[PDB]
Design a protein around this nucleic acid. Structure first.
Ligand SMILES: [Mg+2]
Ligand SMILES: [Mg+2]
Ligand SMILES: [Mg+2]
Ligand SMILES: [Mg+2]
Ligand SMILES: [Mg+2]
Ligand SMILES: [Mg+2]
Ligand SMILES: [Mg+2]
Ligand SMILES: [Mg+2]
Ligand SMILES: [Mg+2]
Ligand SMILES: [Mg+2]
Ligand SMILES: [Mg+2]
Ligand SMILES: [Mg+2]
Ligand SMILES: [Mg+2]
Ligand SMILES: [Mg+2]
Ligand SMILES: [Mg+2]
Ligand SMILES: [Mg+2]
Ligand SMILES: [Mg+2]
Ligand SMILES: [Mg+2]
Ligand SMILES: [Mg+2]
Ligand SMILES: [Mg+2]
Ligand SMILES: [Mg+2]
Ligand SMILES: [Mg+2]
Ligand SMILES: [Mg+2]
Ligand SMILES: [Mg+2]
Ligand SMILES: [Mg+2]
Ligand SMILES: [Mg+2]
Ligand SMILES: [Mg+2]
Ligand SMILES: [Mg+2]
Ligand SMILES: [Mg+2]
Ligand SMILES: [Mg+2]
Ligand SMILES: [Mg+2]
Ligand SMILES: [Mg+2]
Ligand SMILES: [Mg+2]
Ligand SMILES: [Mg+2]
Ligand SMILES: [Mg+2]
Ligand SMILES: [Mg+2]
Ligand SMILES: [Mg+2]
Ligand SMILES: [Mg+2]
Ligand SMILES: [Mg+2]
Ligand SMILES: [Mg+2]
Ligand SMILES: [Mg+2]
Ligand SMILES: [Mg+2]
Ligand SMILES: [Mg+2]
Ligand SMILES: [Mg+2]
Ligand SMILES: [Mg+2]
Ligand SMILES: [Mg+2]
Ligand SMILES: [Mg+2]
Ligand SMILES: [Mg+2]
Ligand SMILES: [Mg+2]
Ligand SMILES: [Mg+2]
Lengths: 109, 236, 95, 46
RNA sequence: GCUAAACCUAGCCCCAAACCCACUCCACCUUACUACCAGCAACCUUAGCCAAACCAUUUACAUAAAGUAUAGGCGAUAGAAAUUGUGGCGCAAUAGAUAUAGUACCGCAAGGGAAAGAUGAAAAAUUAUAACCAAGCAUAAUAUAGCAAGGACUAACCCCUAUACCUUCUGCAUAAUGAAUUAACUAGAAAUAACUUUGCAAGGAGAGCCAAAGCUAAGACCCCCGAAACCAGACGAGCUACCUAAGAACAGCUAAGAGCACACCCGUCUAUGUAGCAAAAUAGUGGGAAGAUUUAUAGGUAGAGGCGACAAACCUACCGAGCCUGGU
RNA sequence: GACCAAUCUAUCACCCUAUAGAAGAACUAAUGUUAGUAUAAGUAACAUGAAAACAUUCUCCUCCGCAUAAGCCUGCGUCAGAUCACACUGACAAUUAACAGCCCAAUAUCUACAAUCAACCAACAAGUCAUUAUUACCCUCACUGUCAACCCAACACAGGCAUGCUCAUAAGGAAAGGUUAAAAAAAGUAAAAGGAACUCGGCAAAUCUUACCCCGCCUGUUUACCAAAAACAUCACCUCUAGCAUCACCAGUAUUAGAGGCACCGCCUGCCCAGUGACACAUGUUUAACGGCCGCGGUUAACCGUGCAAAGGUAGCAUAAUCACUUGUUCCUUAAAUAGGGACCUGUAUGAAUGGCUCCACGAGGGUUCAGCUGUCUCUUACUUUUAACCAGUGAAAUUGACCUGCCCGUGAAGAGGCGGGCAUAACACAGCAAGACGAGAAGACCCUAUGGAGCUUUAAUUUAUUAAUGCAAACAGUAACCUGCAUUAA
């Protein structure tokens, strides 16, 4: 009997305690006989490259110069990638069957 | 409110159906019948009132045989499984309906009468005059909608053109088509009216609450009424 | 009585007084004796003659009738032909 | 007997009798939640 | 001198003026802050309190016409048109919006609801203003006798006097209610008409209204708290009454809605308690304790109603019909 | 009628004043509200078992304790400071699934012999657990709960709480802050002679118990929270209604259901439709429906003379739970009997399913009693504890106009501590007191006023909003069958 007490998994009964739970993000499902199925495709794979011979460092030196901030826009990217437009003197309009679709967020981060 | 009646079954089955007690409540939740609720658990038994019914790829008369005679907690009249052909079904158990006995289920209305036994079922068009019957149907292919309780018996009076005036146990006549199906003999479980409840324990187990405690004043309707028999209720 | 109305916010006159009385500019209220039209067969001729005559009102009654009316009813009455034209003004008086 | 103890806590019954689903099923709970939001309370319903 | 007393700035009310807000990242109608899979949803004459001393028809949602016509148990009352044309003689923590905030607290639920602070230019000033002002105490306990006060007295007491206040009622200390003081808040808003004084006059007023001395303008007059109780919808069967589904409990002894007796269910009686252990407790004598028995979980029955082995009993401590909201 | 404390406004003021405009303009009281503080009051309530090296040991109790569903969310572990002493304030980190939860692809489709050691014995309340063939399927350990002295009762609350376990032990705890034992009360131990003789009552504590009356079938329930029953309900009987199917009443059918009166079993339910209701029953039925069963004069009365209707109380029981008579008469039960019981109708207002009478078992129901029983008393006493007083700590409420508060006589809005006359009177404190201060808590609940209410009852005054049936209208078929509007009927 508390309104300010935020409802969580440490309050309700066994049913709601095991149903809700913290941000678990369902990775698989159950198969009748309480036999969870770990879908290998849904398990994330941390793509970590090799940090061999890295030049930069997580900290910069104050001796470096200072430059103005200019948020990149679509016009600048178009002006940069302007090779075929000038050669006229390749584009992906429809990307429904593409690997990582742009408009519908299908790629993680 | 949320109230889904247990009565939900399509195909006929032999197994007892899990009965859910009602308690005199409607779909809303309010009481509509006083004196119902709180009893012993029971399992409904799907009964097939329509005696004559040709199975698949069949039509002509068929024969059946009784296997066992059991008790029915839903109604006061006991029942008895009777298998036939390539299927089984439950039907009302008539008096002197021993097990392992063959029963006929005809339909072809013969010219002359037919000395029907106690278990066989024939249409009214082939039954002698003045023969007790039960499980009378209101129309051809309708089903037992009247006589069915234990110890009941309907005596035949006469026939007119293509109908038959039946005499219900309550001295209330009734005329029905002659081509309808019926059953001879009387229902089993005789002497049920003489059943001595003995104690309130059995009455409570049966599932019937007692009457209220209000001392009602007997109005004018509490007098002895000697009304005449109502007119014959026909159905032609 | 209604000292203040609900729509405009002013006084209100009781129409019963206007229908049962008559206003005069001289400051007097004229009325009519009751019973002048019921059970006239049992009344002696003198009683009938006295009942068929107008009567004035008292000071308290006149003030009550005035309070039950507004300034609109105190206006003159220059009717083209009215029998009470020679009564609105009172002449010859010394306290 | 002791009449100072009537409360039998139970999250199930509490959330079933005063739940967002029950408060939005009928317009009564809708108006209740609207009035609560208009009042300015922190918690709208259990 | 302990306890105390004051600071006034954050913010509030009025219109004067424009018509407002609203997705970074995940989450939200299932049990709200829950990544994931086969089924109907909408449009409703508001009632009621109150006044007629009851109460049914009745009672309200720029100026002039006009509070006229008209309607009205023709009584209490209701009542039209044609025509017309960017600051505070405000408030300054009991005031101002309830607000430092719709915060705990009552709570299962609708629903109700307050205060935080005080010197300033430096608190990364040590170090404190000037004590003084109410209510309770210390500095400082009483010394025949009696509404606590007077005439006095060279002197406190000693001398004589007098029956607390307000309201009621013909009548009062009366033993009729009110009262521990202190600081803050707290109870007469105006009307057809009338009286006094200004200005003009058979006219005045900045259309309209009144005129056989009249009108205009100002001044002066109409209290507060207090029920039982109704309407419409929410909130309420987690305790009590009933119903539904699936479970649990009942030693032992004598021997069947059998008998004694554990656990267990209720409490016929004594005693204690009575601001207590408890806004319904503690021991036995008490009836049952394989059955009309008790109970863990969930769902359903909500007031003109539900339920009811009728106790006209219960429906969240007060049910001859629970509380809230708006009429009040 | 004459003045006037405070504020803002327009006017020179300016150690605080004047002229006019405004009132949220001026408190000894409205069991008025907010804040602190007196009053009983340092009075009521209160805890912590003992020794000690603070290692440890000793005394007593236990129906309590273990894990879990319901429920809480870190709530007596460490670190520094705060204090009956601390569970108080800030950081530390716990609690890791194998236990439980998070759960099932489709199509036709089917489970008659319950459990109770289930085999003998069977019974009624008829009962909780199953699958068949085809298609597609092959990746496998993801998430939540895991603590405590803990939940609901405003409190650290003798209170309320289910499941499997030894229920007294391997669990679980300390009734005594320290001294004395004034008075009063309560829980226990015993009592010289009586065992219910104080008492309306055999009402606490002990024996353990014999025979009666009223009522209730017995079990069971009732007014949680003063009345627990002689009331409520029915196993048994009886009255009325219903001829039928798709949400219950019903997946039921006249031996079945619904609405009622009484109380099982035994003897019985005698009479009356003038009046009301229900049946159109061709004019009558229904009283086990609403209700009723009479008077005047006579040899302490049959039978005569009769009047009226429905009969004029039949059987039965009797001083009743039965209007005064009532403490009846009548014989006992004792020393006394308005306590108890054997018979009389004279109960004039008893009397039959609004049920009359007996009876098998029974009653926390209401009243008596024979042989045993206890301090209830005759007449009370001794001991332990609770408890009380003092020494240390904290620490309320009801209440109070101020009190410097005596007594007697008479008065007094009619009972005087404050009044008229007399007696008395040094100062305060503890230890008991309940005669008075018409003592203290509740706008007396008994009586009365309220053109203030609410519950209940209809033949009180009004409207049929609603249900169902009636006559008419449109509405279609016939010839020479659902909605809608207008009035009536019962609810
Ligand atoms: Mg309490
Ligand atoms: Mg009024
Ligand atoms: Mg009125
Ligand atoms: Mg106009
Ligand atoms: Mg304020
Ligand atoms: Mg304020
Ligand atoms: Mg002082
Ligand atoms: Mg004095
Ligand atoms: Mg006064
Ligand atoms: Mg007064
Ligand atoms: Mg008087
Ligand atoms: Mg007094
Ligand atoms: Mg003049
Ligand atoms: Mg419940
Ligand atoms: Mg009950
Ligand atoms: Mg008793
Ligand atoms: Mg007491
Ligand atoms: Mg009993
Ligand atoms: Mg027993
Ligand atoms: Mg037992
Ligand atoms: Mg109410
Ligand atoms: Mg004051
Ligand atoms: Mg008072
Ligand atoms: Mg006061
Ligand atoms: Mg005292
Ligand atoms: Mg102790
Ligand atoms: Mg645990
Ligand atoms: Mg002590
Ligand atoms: Mg002796
Ligand atoms: Mg003795
Ligand atoms: Mg005596
Ligand atoms: Mg005696
Ligand atoms: Mg006695
Ligand atoms: Mg005995
Ligand atoms: Mg009984
Ligand atoms: Mg009571
Ligand atoms: Mg009781
Ligand atoms: Mg009964
Ligand atoms: Mg019965
Ligand atoms: Mg009779
Ligand atoms: Mg008597
Ligand atoms: Mg003490
Ligand atoms: Mg002390
Ligand atoms: Mg008091
Ligand atoms: Mg006196
Ligand atoms: Mg006195
Ligand atoms: Mg008093
Ligand atoms: Mg009074
Ligand atoms: Mg009234
Ligand atoms: Mg009223």
């Amino acid at each position: 009997a508390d309104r300010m007490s935020k409802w969580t998994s440490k309050r309700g009964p066994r049913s709601f305690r095991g149903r809700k739970g913290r941000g678990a993000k369902g990775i698989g499902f159950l198969t009748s006989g309480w036999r969870f199925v770990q879908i290998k495709e849904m398990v994330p794979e941390f793509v970590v490259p090799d940090l061999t011979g890295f030049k930069l460092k997580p900290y910069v030196s104050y001796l470096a110069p200072e430059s103005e901030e200019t948020p990149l826009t679509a016009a600048q990217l178009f002006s940069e990638a302007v090779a075929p437009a000038i050669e006229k003197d390749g584009f992906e309009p429809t990307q429904e069957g593409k690997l990582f679709q742009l408009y519908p967020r299908n790629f993680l981060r | 409110a949320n109230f889904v009646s247990w009565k939900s079954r399509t195909k006929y089955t032999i197994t007892p159906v899990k009965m859910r007690k009602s308690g005199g409540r409607d779909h809303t939740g309010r009481i509509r019948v006083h004196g119902i609720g709180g009893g012993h658990k029971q399992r409904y038994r799907m009964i097939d009132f329509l005696r004559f019914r040709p199975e698949e790829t069949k039509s002509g008369p068929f024969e059946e045989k009784v296997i066992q005679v059991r008790y029915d907690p839903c109604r006061s009249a006991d029942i008895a499984l009777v298998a036939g052909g390539s299927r089984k079904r439950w039907i009302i158990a008539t008096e002197n309906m021993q097990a392992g006995d063959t029963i006929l289920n005809s339909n072809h209305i013969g010219r002359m009468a037919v000395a029907a036994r106690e278990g066989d079922a024939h249409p009214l068009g082939a039954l002698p005059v003045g023969t007790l019957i039960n499980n009378v149907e209101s129309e051809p292919g309708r089903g037992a909608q009247y006589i069915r309780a234990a110890g009941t018996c309907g005596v035949l009076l006469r026939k007119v053109n293509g109908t038959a005036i039946i005499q219900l146990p309550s001295k209330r006549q009734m005329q029905v088509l002659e081509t309808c199906v019926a059953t001879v003999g009387r229902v089993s479980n005789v002497d049920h009216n003489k059943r001595v409840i003995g104690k309130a324990g059995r009455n409570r187990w049966l599932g019937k609450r007692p009457n209220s405690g209000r001392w009602h004043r007997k109005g004018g309707w509490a007098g002895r009424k000697i009304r005449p028999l109502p007119p014959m209720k026909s159905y032609v | 009585l209604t000292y203040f109305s609900a729509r405009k916010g002013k006084r209100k006159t009781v129409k019963a007084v206007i229908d049962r009385f008559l206003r005069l500019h001289c400051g007097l209220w004229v009325r009519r004796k009751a019973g002048y039209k019921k059970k006239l067969w049992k009344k002696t001729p003198a009683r009938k003659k006295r009942l068929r005559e107008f009567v004035f009102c008292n000071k308290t009654q006149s003030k009550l009738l005035d309070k039950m009316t507004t300034s609109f009813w105190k206006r003159r009455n220059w009717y083209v032909d009215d029998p009470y034209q020679k009564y609105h003004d009172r002449t010859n008086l010394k306290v | 007997k002791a009449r100072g103890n009537e409360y039998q806590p139970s999250n199930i019954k509490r959330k079933n009798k005063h739940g967002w689903v029950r408060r939005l099923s009928t317009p009564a709970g809708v108006q209740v939640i609207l009035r609560r939001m208009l009042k300015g309370r922190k918690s709208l319903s259990h």
